[PDB]
Amino acid sequence: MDGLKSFLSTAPVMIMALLTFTAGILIEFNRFYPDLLFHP
């Protein structure tokens, strides 16, 4: 139903989903290529 599709798309749920996704991006990038004080 749409009542739960609207709850999954609320401000806090989405603003935490984006933060989790960006955390995953940054964590994996600094896992495979860590220690980038600058660009070579």
Residues lying near other proteins in the complex (CB under 8 A): 1-7, 9-10, 27, 30-31, 34
Q: Which pair of tokens denotes residue 12? A: 């806090």
From the list other proteins, ligand CLA, none, which binds 22 (C-beta under 5 to 8 Å, kind-based)? none
Separation of alpha carbons 8 and 38, rounded Å: 38
Separation of alpha carbons 38 and 23, rounded Å: 20
From the list ligand CLA, other proteins, none, which binds 29 (C-beta under 5 to 8 Å, kind-based)? ligand CLA
Q: Which residues bind ligand CLA (CB under 6 A)?
A: 29-30, 34-37
